[PDB]
Assembly symmetry: C12
Homo-oligomer: 66 residues x 12
């Protein structure tokens, strides 16, 4: 399955998983402090991922930094 790479560029970045299915709510928020990296898949439970805070992000479509 597809995955996303997120590197926090400041303290307190949040990577938030939104629930798969008819209903949509946040099911988990992972905090990242400056420099820390999360590599996260889309899954049975997660069909959208929201990133809050300054981050460098890689997906299959390329890079987004800031």
């Amino acid at each position: 399955s597809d995955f996303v790479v997120i590197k926090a560029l400041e303290d307190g970045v949040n990577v938030i998983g939104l629930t798969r299915g008819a209903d949509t709510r946040f099911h988990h928020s992972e905090k990242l402090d400056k420099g820390e990296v999360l590599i996260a898949q889309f899954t049975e439970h997660t069909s959208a991922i929201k990133v809050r805070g300054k981050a460098y992000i890689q997906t299959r479509h390329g890079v987004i930094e800031s």
Copy 2:
């Protein structure tokens, strides 16, 4: 399964999921504040995605950037 990457370039960008099926309504609107990013898949429940507000958008087909670049890729 395809996904879209959306970066908000203003506050209050709305990423709107429309229902898969005979009927089309929005089932969810996810708000993004400036600089926030949403990576959203098409799914059993969402077969079209509408973005309202200045956004930088990447899909498999390329990049669309409000008031900026539009490039096939």
Copy 3:
């Protein structure tokens, strides 16, 4: 590549993106209005086998771009 979609960015107000029914019959089942700079990323689906766009729009598909509309 087991599902495809179209990207539509409105270049003026009042753009419409219209889904045509899959099957023996062909009728408009939904028209989605876009104002200037709004983006619709829409799949072909069990219910939609053709998409019509009216108004000035920038469109991306697997086949490339059609712009300045």
Copy 4:
């Protein structure tokens, strides 16, 4: 499935679906006025598409404009 992109370059372009199966007749004609775009799949019901009028057409094989 394969799809075709058609942009009308004048008013009154017609995109016509021809029926799949042993019999061949037109089952639908979609009118396009100048500048309007139809993105149409091949389907269970449509195995050939005919375009009448001045159009810019994209398929997997490339572009045909005029």
Copy 5:
């Protein structure tokens, strides 16, 4: 499933579908007037397609243009 793109460059171009099976007959002839386009698939019923008349033709294998370009691609 393969398809062919045919553009008529004169009136009365005939795109002829021949029957899939032990026997070969034409089951349909679709007439194109000049500048009209037919995008036709091979199918359960059509296993060969004959084009009579000046036409610009694209397939997976390339382009054939009456009195013009023939290019592999």
Copy 6:
């Protein structure tokens, strides 16, 4: 790539495109006549496992071109 086909353009009158039967036996089952500039796009099929072309023709297959015949 789950089915293949051959493109044959006649460069003179009286070109023949001939299908040979699939199976233990091999016989001509159909000859299709092409006049100058006529095009045949023909698949390999349940019934046709070899194709013979006689006369001057431009031919395209997955393997490339054979022309000036």
Copy 7:
């Protein structure tokens, strides 16, 4: 399935199908006269093809001419 393209460069070229299975014998010989083309698949009945006479041959591996 794979196929071979053979163009006869002189009269009397023979394209010969050899039988698939434990036994190997010629099951068919197609004669080609100068300029004629045979496009032949590997099949249930044919697992090797022999070309006799001057020919220009294309396969997935490239061209052999002479």
Copy 8:
């Protein structure tokens, strides 16, 4: 491409590579400590659907490199 993995090389002592549980709940199930120059090649699996790395590390995934950490 029916399974993916991440390569993590520690650029300092005390790097941690942390697996997050697959499923409705998300919790750290294992933290693997790496000292300077140690390498972990770790798959996504039935039990691990997200990986967190803390500390200075060079990382390779299918999407490319993230370094100087």
Copy 9:
């Protein structure tokens, strides 16, 4: 299913099919005279092919030409 192309560059080139299974024997030797070509598949019965005699050989892995070119491809 892979195949090999063999062109004989002398008379009496032997293309030898060896048996698929626990045991290895030649089950067939096809003789090629100079300039003849054999396009032979691996099959349920043939899991190795030996060529004896000057030959130009193409496979998926490249070209081997007796007293000439050897090239990966």
Copy 10:
């Protein structure tokens, strides 16, 4: 099924297989002396591999060389 190539550049390089499942322990450590090579797959039993010691490592994602090159590929 992915595999990793590990070349030891000192004695006593340890290639450590960690267990596939809810629990993570090392089930095996294969020692390599300088210049020895291990080509190891991920498997039903091994879902992560740890390398301790100076090593030249190749995977699908590229090359990592202790005190040397790191290159995506």
Copy 11:
């Protein structure tokens, strides 16, 4: 790519190409002798999971060439 094979051209007399048995046990099951310029195109199979070549040979596999032996 659902089956692979190796190409071996002997560059001297007495080259041997040796098949090693697939399964729990590993033993030579066949040695095929090649004289100078003879070519063997040999698959991996239900019975052969490793191939040993002794003597001077030019070899092609999916991974490239190994020559001047």
Copy 12:
């Protein structure tokens, strides 16, 4: 399945197959003398291969020589 190519660059190179499954032990060691080549698959019984001695090795990931 994947395979490895090993060419011995000195006498007495050993190519060692390690067992697939929960247990890991050497199940076979093939000796190669200078210049000899082993082309070895990963299999039901072999999920890791160890090479001892000076060798030129090719895999899908490239070459390692020395």
